[PDB]
Amino acid sequence: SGFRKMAFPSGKVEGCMVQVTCGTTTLNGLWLDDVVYCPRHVICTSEDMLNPNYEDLLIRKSNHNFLVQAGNVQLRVIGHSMQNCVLKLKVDTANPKTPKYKFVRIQPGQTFSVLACYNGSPSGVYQCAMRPNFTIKGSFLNGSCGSVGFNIDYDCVSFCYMHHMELPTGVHAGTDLEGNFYGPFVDRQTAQAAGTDTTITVNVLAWLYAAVINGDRWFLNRFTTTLNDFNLVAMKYNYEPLTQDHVDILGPLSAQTGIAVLDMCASLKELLQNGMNGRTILGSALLEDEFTPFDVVRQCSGVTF
Amino acid sequence: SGFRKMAFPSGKVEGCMVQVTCGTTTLNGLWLDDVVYCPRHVICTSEDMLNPNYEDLLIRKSNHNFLVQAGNVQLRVIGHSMQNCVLKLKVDTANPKTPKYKFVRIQPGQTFSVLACYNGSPSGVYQCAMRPNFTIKGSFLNGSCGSVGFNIDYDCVSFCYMHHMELPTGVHAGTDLEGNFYGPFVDRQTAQAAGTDTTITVNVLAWLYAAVINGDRWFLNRFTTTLNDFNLVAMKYNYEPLTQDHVDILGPLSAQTGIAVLDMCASLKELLQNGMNGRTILGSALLEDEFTPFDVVRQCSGVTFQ
Ligand SMILES: N#Cc1ccccc1-c1cc(-c2cc(Cl)cc(OCC3CC3)c2)c(=O)n(-c2cccnc2)c1
Ligand SMILES: N#Cc1ccccc1-c1cc(-c2cc(Cl)cc(OCC3CC3)c2)c(=O)n(-c2cccnc2)c1
C-alpha cells in the first residue's frame, strides 16, 4: 500500500548522457548508437538567439567546434547536421551502453520521467505530464537544456522529450527527439507565453480509482451521470472533455475496483461543485491530474524493468 | 524555476539489486563488493512469524540454502552471518558495478530516494522522509522487502534504509544497513502500531523559503515571533518543536531571501491560522514537510526571483 509520484528507474538513460560544448555554451546531449542529440540553440551566441538563422550559423562550424565529453572521455565528432530543432553530432564510436530504444511523440495528458542533467551529469529524476497547453511543469536551472524525458516498456526506452526553454511563468518547453516542438513555441529569445491550461480529466479519474484502491472512499456516492451531462460540468470548471476512449481506457481500473466510470464521474462532479469538506484524498487537498490510468495500474501491480 | 519531489538518479543502485530466496520465500538483496545484504526474515516460514528465534532458524541453514540471482546469473554463497536484523551473505563474486558508497543512519525529518524493487528488479523511484514516528510513507507491495533508500550527494551513495515491514495503517518500517530498526519496531508479526505522527516543522519552513526563491511572497506578514511563542502555537497544530539547531540550519536560506528565520515562523503561524484562502504554494494546497533545507538548496537557484 501507499501511493507516491513515481518515476521509472533512470539507469538505462544515465549511461546515455554526455556534455556538449560549442564555444562558450555548455549543455547536455543524448548519446545513442553513434549519434549525439542536443538542442540546436547550442550553436548560438546570446545575440544570435535574438533572431537566429540556424543554417547560416552552422556553416561557420566544423566538427572540431563541438566538444563532446562522456564522463572523462572525449568523443570524436565526425559529422554534424540538423533535424528540425535538434542538432545531430555523428561520433566515431557507438555508445556501448545504448539501450533498446525508440523515439516517440506523446500527446497532452501523457506522463513521463525527466532525468535532469547538468554538464553531462545526471542530477535528479522526477515525474512530469505534458500539459494540455503543451508545456511541462518541470524543475530546471540554467545548464539543463538537453535533459530528456522518457518512458520504459519492458526493456525498451521510449524517449519523448528534450528540454529547450524556460517560459516567463516558469514552466518549460521542448521538442520530441526528432526536433519537433511540443506547443506553439520557437527556439528564439523573444516574447512567448504559455496559454491558459486545463485539468486532465481522465487522469483525475484515474487517481480517484487509485484512492479507492488505497482505501480512500469518502467521495463515493449513490449517483451516476451521463457522458454528455458530465462534459458540461467539465467545461464549466476548465477540465478537458471526457471521451468514450477515456472511458474504455479506464477499463482495467474500473475492473480492478469494480466501479463504473460514469459512477466515478458523478463523484468528480460533486467534488467540482462542492469541493472537499476540509478533507484530503491520497494526501492531497487538490484534485491530482498527473497520474495516467497506466501509471495507476503500473504502481498498484509492481511491474519491473 | 519549478519545484518537484526530485529523487536521485537510481542507476548506481539498480546495478546492486539482486534476488534472494530461502525456502519458498523470495525478496530483494543489496549486492556491494562480495556481500549481499537482505532482511533476516527471509529465513522465516509462514508458521513461525509471531516469535521467530532467528539464531535457531539460521543455525539450521547451510550456504547452499540461499539462492542469490543477479539478473540471470546465480551467485555462489560461501558464508552467512546475521548483524542485528540484516542477513549478510558472502558470495564468491564481487559486484563489478559497486559504486562508491557508505552506510549512514539518518534522523527523523531527513529525506532519501527509494528504489522499489520486486524479484531483484527495479520498479520505480520516489522521494521519502523519515517521519517523526520512525515510519516512512512509502509505496510498497508484497515482495518489496529488501528495497533500499539512499542519497547520492556528490559521487557517493549513502544507503540509509532497507525495507522490512508494512504496518496496519499502510506505512512502512525498516532498518539502517547495519540492521538496526528505525523506531521501536521488531521483525515479527506481533501487534505493532505506528505512534502518533507530527509535521516536520523545519521542512515546512524550508519549503516556504523555496516558494520565495521561486517568486511568491503572498503569505508573508509584517510580524515576528520568539522561538518559544512559535513552538507554543505550532504544537497546537501537531507540529514538531523547532530547535535552535533547526534555526541555524535555515540560515543559508534566510540569507538568500533576506527573510529572518523567526519572521518566516510568523508567516507559518498565520498560515496555520488562516489556511491558504483558495491559493496554492508550489503547486500544493497543503503545507508540505518532506523537503529539507538541504533539499531546497540542492534543487533551487542561488538567485532569488525578486
Ligand atoms: N541550458 C542551457 C543554456 C546554455 C547556454 C546558453 C543558454 C542556455 C539556455 C537557453 C534558454 C533559451 C533558449 C532559447 Cl533558443 C530561447 C529562450 O527563450 C526564453 C524566452 C521565450 C521565453 C530561452 C533557456 O530557457 N535556458 C534555461 C534556463 C533555465 C531553465 N531551463 C532552460 C538555458
Ligand atoms: N517482501 C516480502 C515477503 C516475502 C515472503 C514472505 C513475506 C514477505 C513480507 C513480510 C512482511 C513482514 C515481515 C515481518 Cl518479520 C513482520 C511483519 O509484521 C507486519 C505486522 C507487525 C505489523 C511483516 C511484510 O510487511 N511484507 C510487506 C508486504 C507489503 C509491503 N511491504 C512489506 C512482506
The CATH number given to A11-91 is 2.40.10.10
Cell of A221: 456516492
Only one residue has cell 519458498, namely: B24
Nearest-CA neighbor of B80 among B43, B127, B129? Answer: B43
**Other C-beta atoms lying within 10 Å of the C-beta of residue A297:** 18
Out of A46, A145, A187, A188, mutate this one to test ligand 1's pocket (max ligand atoms within 8 Å of CB): namely A145
Other CB atoms within 10 A of residue B220 CB? 18
Contacts of A77 (CB under 8 A, 6+ apart): A36, A63, A64, A66, A68, A89, A90, A91
DSSP reduced 3-state for A161: strand
**B259: number of Cβ within 10 Å:** 20
Does any ligand 2 atom lie closer than 6 A to the CB of residue B143? yes
A163 flagged as catalytic? no
Q: How far apart are CA A49 and CA A256, in angstroms?
A: 52
Rounded to whole angstroms, how far apart are CA atoms A296 and A276? 22
Locate B219 and state its grid cell: 503569505
Q: Which three cell numbers stand for residue A43?
A: 550553436
- Subunit contact B140:A1, Cβ cutoff 8 A: yes
Question: What secondary structure does DSSP assign to A263-292, as a single string?
Answer: HHHHHHHHHHHH--SS--BTTBSS------
Cell numbers standing for residue A54: 540556424
Q: Which of A16, A22, A41, A128 is the catalytic position?
A: A41
| Whether A38 contacts A143, CB under 8 Å | no
Are B89 and B38 contacting, i.e. CB atoms less than 8 angstroms apart? yes
Q: Which is it for strands A66-70 and B157-166: parallel, antiparallel or unpaired? A: unpaired
- Alpha carbon distances (Å) from B52 to B24, B172, B176: 16, 20, 21
CA distance B88 to B32: 11
Q: Residue A245: what residue type?
A: D
Q: What are the start-end ranges of the E strands in B104-213? A: 111-118, 121-129, 148-151, 157-166, 172-175
Query: Burial, B12: exposed, middle or buried (Cβ in 10 Å; 0-12, 13-18, 19+)?
Result: buried
**Which residue is associated with the grid cell 562550424?**
A61
According to DSSP, residue B155 is labeled: T
DSSP string, A101-135: EEE----TT-EEEEEEEETTEEEEEEEEE--TTS-
Is B10 within 8 Å of A9 when comparing Cβ atoms? yes
Q: Which residue, among B19, B123, B141, B296, would best test binding to A if mutated, counting the most A CBs under 10 Å from its CB? A: B123
Q: Which of B116, B129, B130, B16 is nearest to B75 (CA)?
A: B16
Q: Whose CA is closest to A174, among A199, A147, A200?
A: A147
B72's grid cell: 540471470
In sequence order, the 6+-apart residues with CB closer than 8 A to the CB of A165 are A145, A172, A173, A174, A185, A187, A192
Q: Considering Cα of B283, then B287, then B293, then B294, what sign does the dihedral take?
A: negative
Beta bridge partners of B7: A125
d(CA A11, CA A13): 5
Question: Which letter, b or e, does each residue of A231-248 get, where b requires 16 or more Cβ atoms within 10 Å of its Cβ?
Answer: bebbeeeebbebeeebbe
Q: Identify whether the C-beta of residue A299 lies closer than 8 Å to the C-beta of residue A209.
A: no
Angle at B6 between CA B1 and CA B10, to 5 degrees: 135
> Quick count: other Cβ atoms within 10 Å of Cβ A204?
23
Length of chain B: 306
CB B98: neighbour CB atoms within 10 A? 16
Report whether A120 contacts A69 (CB < 8 A).
yes
Q: CB–CB of A265/A225 below 8 Å? A: yes
Up-side HSE of residue A218: CA atoms within 13 Å toward CB? 9
| Alpha-carbon distance values, A51 to A189, B19, B297 (Å) | 7, 56, 35
**Interface touch A126/B170, C-beta < 8 Å:** no
Please tell me the number of the ligand nearest to residue A54's CA.
1
- Amino acid letter, B191: A
Furthest-apart CA pair in chain A: how many Å?
69
Burial class (CB in 10 A: 0-12, 13-18, 19+), B241: middle
Cell 556481500 sits on residue? B35
| Distance between first and last Cα of chain B | 13
Given a contact cutoff of 8 angstroms between Cβ atoms, the answer to whether A112 and A6 are in contact is: no
In this structure, are residues A126 and B5 in contact, taking their beta carbons and an 8 Å threshold? yes
B41 is catalytic: yes
CB B138 within 8 A of CB B171: yes
Question: What's the distance, CA A216 to chain centroid?
Answer: 28
Mutation target to probe the A interface, by most A beta carbons within 10 A, among B10, B26, B142, B274 is B10
d(CA B55, CA B82): 8
Chain A residue with the nearest C-alpha to that of B167: A1
Query: Residue type for A41, please?
Result: H
DSSP string computed for A15-72:
TTEEEEEETTEEEEEEEETTEEEEEGGGG--TTGGGS--HHHHHHT--GGGEEEEETT
- Angle at which helix B261-274 crosses helix B227-234, to 10 degrees, equals 30
| Count of positions (residues) in chain A | 305
Q: Count H helices and E strands in chain A, helices first.
A: 8, 13
For B192-259, the DSSP string reads: -------B-HHHHHHHHHHHHHTT--TT--S----HHHHHHHHGGGTBPPPPHHHHHHTHHHHHHHT-
Q: What is the SS3 assignment for A7?
A: strand
Is there a contact between A162 and A85 (Cβ–Cβ < 8 Å)? Answer: no
C-alpha angle with apex A291: B10 to A164, nearest 5 degrees? 65
Residues with Cβ within 8 Å of A44's Cβ and at least 6 positions away in sequence, in order, are: A25, A52, A54, A57
Task: For residue B223, give Cα distances in angstroms to B2, B263, B268.
Answer: 28, 6, 11
In the 8-state DSSP scheme, what is residue A6?
-
- Phi then psi dihedrals of residue A235, to 5 deg: -60, -40
Q: How far apart are CA A86 and CA A148, in angstroms?
A: 12
Residue with cell 495507476: A296
Q: Which residues pair with B67 in a beta bridge?
A: B21
B72 near A CB under 8 A: no
Task: Count Cβ atoms within 10 A of the Cβ of residue B47 and give its class: 0-12 exposed, 13-18 middle, 19 or more buried.
Answer: exposed
Q: Which CATH superfamily is domain B201-299 in?
A: main proteinase (3clpro) structure, domain 3 (1.10.1840.10)
User: Quick one: fold of A201-300?
Assistant: main proteinase (3clpro) structure, domain 3 (1.10.1840)
Dihedral, CA of residue A280, residue A282, residue A284 and residue A290, to nearest 10: -140
Stretch (H or E) spanning A153? strand A148-153
Strands lying side by side in the sheet with A17-22: A73-75, A66-70, A17-22, A25-32, A35-39, A86-91, A77-83
Ligand 2 contacts CB of residue B88 (under 6 A): no
Cβ of residue B34 lying under 6 Å from some atom of ligand 2: no
- Cβ(A132)–Cβ(B16) under 8 Å? no
Max CA-CA distance within chain B?
69
Which residues from chain A sit within 8 angstroms of residue B142, using beta carbons? 302
Listed in sequence order, the residues at least 6 apart from B278 whose beta carbon sits closer than 8 Å to its beta carbon are none
Contact (Cβ atoms closer than 8 angstroms) between residue A214 and residue A258: no
Residues in A 192-211 with any Cβ partner in B closer than 8 A: none
